[PDB]
């Protein structure tokens, strides 16, 4: 049932029959050749790699939200996410659960596969069929293939090899500068399966991505409120906050941030200097030669963490890039420059 459930999810994952007009599968936007992101909507498509390590969405005892799926956490976990994305008009866009069940019923392999795991006639019950498909998709993403922990960083932490001087400097910067306040699992101690995110929600004051927003059709009067958009969240302190992404594979999953606003990994690193540096250049996005832009949501910024008092000089930017490239899974190392 473990292997079998995941194997069913693997077949679903590449099947365009789960899309409104049979045009795209999960693999369309999450290409395994590109760390399960889009090699070719208002938000950037995130990697599926290591998404299975994220806890279910919850409010912790200090009142911080953590975990969940989607950039705004609107899904509790992978199973709930799969159901949402199959029905979401901006992704798979299936009109309803009965339509999904009907596509499944049309395929003799799915009758066999789903009945063996969930019982005879499961595909005749739209709620049970849809829930089973979401569960199989979640199981598939929870396999080792999606989270293999075989990057250079992994090998170095196992003592199998060593960082280069530049990578070791980048590692030391990462763990002593503000990056570790958000892009490490734990506050202290050593994580067993580190994915370079504390699963929290933070507004880092990103500007709108003009061209993506234009193309989304959402209208220029649209504002993306991040976590506040999750149904049931009403707390106005959550407005503009987004889930901290895992930095695993980050070197190969550009463009960056929730809206794809920066094309280059170095730009994403330099953005943090806008909070710390007094140089005129720290104000300028190097990809455009113009000021970064005012925050899309000008409240709830994580100023305590971001206004660290220290600017990254170019050498430390080079070092962080080198360190972030060591978090690339083995099968993606050929993609590095």
């Amino acid at each position: 049932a473990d292997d079998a459930l995941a194997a069913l999810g693997a077949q679903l994952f590449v099947d365009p029959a789960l899309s409104r007009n049979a045009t795209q599968s999960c693999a369309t936007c999450h290409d395994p050749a590109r760390a399960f992101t889009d090699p070719r909507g208002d938000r950037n498509t995130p990697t599926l790699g290591y998404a299975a390590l994220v806890p279910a969405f919850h409010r912790d005892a200090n009142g911080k939200y953590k975990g969940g799926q989607f950039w705004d956490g609107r899904a509790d976990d992978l199973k709930q996410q799969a159901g949402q994305v199959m029905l979401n008009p901006v992704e798979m866009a299936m009109p309803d659960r009965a339509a999904v069940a009907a596509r499944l019923r049309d395929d003799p392999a799915y009758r066999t596969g789903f009945e063996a795991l969930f019982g005879k006639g499961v595909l005749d019950d739209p709620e049970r069929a849809f829930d089973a498909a979401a569960e199989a998709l979640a199981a598939y993403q929870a396999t080792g293939e999606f989270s293999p922990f075989d990057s250079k960083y992994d090998r170095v932490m196992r003592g199998e090899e060593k960082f280069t001087p530049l990578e070791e400097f980048g590692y030391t910067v990462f763990i002593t500068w503000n990056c570790r306040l958000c892009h490490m699992q734990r506050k202290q101690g050593v994580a067993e399966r580190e994915t370079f995110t504390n699963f929290e929600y933070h507004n880092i004051g990103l500007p709108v991505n003009e061209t993506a927003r234009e193309a989304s059709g959402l209208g220029a009067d649209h504002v993306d409120h991040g976590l506040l958009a999750r149904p049931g969240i009403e707390d106005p302190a959550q407005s503009g906050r987004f889930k901290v992404p895992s930095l695993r594979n980050v070197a190969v999953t550009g463009p960056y941030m929730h809206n794809g606003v920066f094309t280059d990994l170095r730009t994403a690193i330099l953005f943090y200097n806008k909070y710390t540096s007094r140089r005129p250049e720290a104000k300028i996005n190097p990809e455009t030669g113009a000021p970064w832009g005012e925050p899309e949501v000008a409240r709830n910024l994580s100023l305590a963490e971001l206004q660290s008092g220290l600017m990254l000089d170019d050498g430390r930017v080079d070092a962080l890039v080198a360190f972030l490239e060591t978090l690339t899974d083995r099968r993606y190392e050929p993609l590095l420059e």
Partner: protein, 376 residues
């Protein structure tokens, strides 16, 4: 047996082996309770100073408070806050002087008020606890001024504002007994009762002179505001007791802390906070030793304990260190605190047996003043 440092190592190691995570953060002090004790370090007149907040049960520093030049600490008896009157200058020890009162939350230690005192009016003196004092309701702080003349400043802690200076006669120390009344000790040997309003000359009355000019009353009497009991030793260990609990001073019989034989053999109190008073047991504790008549500010190695009502000696403890100040917790089976200015160490003893239980060292440069709350 296991020290705090050892227990903490054992716990962090257990946390590490178990993969337990915790967030680095700013701790809260534990809730004020009867066994909390504060030690102030005037630091032999340094321009800046420190107060240590100590859990007397565990013998653990649980927090600190910084202060300026010779600040006067106070601690509300009910545990609700602590405060001090303090003095800073714009270039360490030179330049513009600012005197101010800070009020602190007793768990976060964050200042909840900072109240400027106009015209730099504090009396700068080696620290005497009853030179700055809270009224019983905790709403007002009264501080002493010496220059240009004796006067008492009135600070409204509730409204967070300086109110006024009161002119007083040639008198010293401030023992409040009500929201608008306090007592002082006058050069002429009487106490003065001062009843004051927001404006207007205060009403000042004097007791009879209760000591002659050649009997010397120490700068550190014990005063229990909850009992209205003022316990005032002289250089020879004769102890005056004045009951202010009715609102007017009634005098109690004077007692001797030392026997006639001990005084003939050179026993005399000495140190800084030489006397403590436990209100529920109605017991007095006095630091004494064999000493020359003019070595009255030296440390002492003994504490005598006497029944305040009869003068009967109940114990004489060999403290086993050079002790400058004492005080007690005001709970049932109290701790006797014994602070060494030279060792910069608070020794915490069982007040009934005199046994040293534990100690807290490295308390600044010259710690001198112990304060506890009477929460009962």
């Amino acid at each position: 047996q296991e020290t705090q440092g050892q227990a903490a190592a054992r716990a962090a190691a257990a946390d590490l082996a178990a993969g337990q995570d915790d967030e680095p953060r700013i701790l809260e002090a534990p809730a004020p309770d009867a066994r909390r004790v504060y030690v102030n370090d005037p630091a032999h007149f340094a321009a800046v100073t420190q107060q240590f907040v100590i859990d007397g049960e565990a013998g653990r520093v649980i927090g600190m408070i910084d202060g300026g030049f010779l600040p006067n600490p106070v601690v509300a008896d009910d545990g609700s806050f602590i405060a001090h009157a303090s003095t800073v200058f714009s270039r360490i020890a030179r330049g513009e002087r600012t005197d101010y009162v800070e009020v602190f939350d007793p768990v976060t230690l964050l200042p909840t008020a900072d109240i400027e005192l106009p015209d730099a009016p504090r009396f700068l003196v080696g620290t005497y606890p009853w030179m700055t004092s809270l009224t019983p309701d905790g709403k007002t702080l009264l501080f002493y001024q010496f220059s240009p003349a004796p006067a008492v400043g009135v600070v409204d802690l509730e409204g967070k504002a300086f109110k006024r200076m009161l002119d007083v006669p040639d008198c010293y120390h401030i023992f409040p007994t009500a929201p608008d009344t306090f007592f002082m000790h006058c050069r002429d040997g009487s106490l003065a009762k001062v009843a004051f309003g927001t404006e207007g000359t205060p009403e000042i009355t004097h007791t009879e002179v209760f000591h002659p000019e050649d009997e010397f009353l120490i700068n550190h009497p014990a005063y229990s505001q909850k009992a209205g009991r003022l316990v005032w030793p002289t250089y020879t260990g004769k102890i005056h007791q004045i009951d202010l609990s009715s609102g007017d001073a009634k005098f109690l019989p004077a007692v001797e802390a030392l026997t006639e034989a001990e005084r003939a053999d050179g026993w005399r109190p000495g140190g800084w906070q030489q006397v403590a008073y436990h209100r529920a047991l109605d017991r007095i504790y006095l630091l004494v030793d064999q000493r020359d008549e003019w070595r009255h500010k030296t440390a002492s190695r003994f504490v005598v304990v006497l029944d305040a009502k009869t003068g009967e000696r109940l114990a004489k403890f060999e403290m086993g260190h050079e002790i400058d100040s004492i005080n007690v917790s005001q709970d049932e089976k109290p701790l006797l605190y014994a602070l060494s200015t030279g060792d910069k160490t608070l020794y915490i003893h069982d007040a009934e047996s005199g046994e040293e239980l534990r100690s807290v060292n490295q308390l600044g440069h010259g710690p001198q003043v112990i304060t506890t709350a009477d929460m009962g």
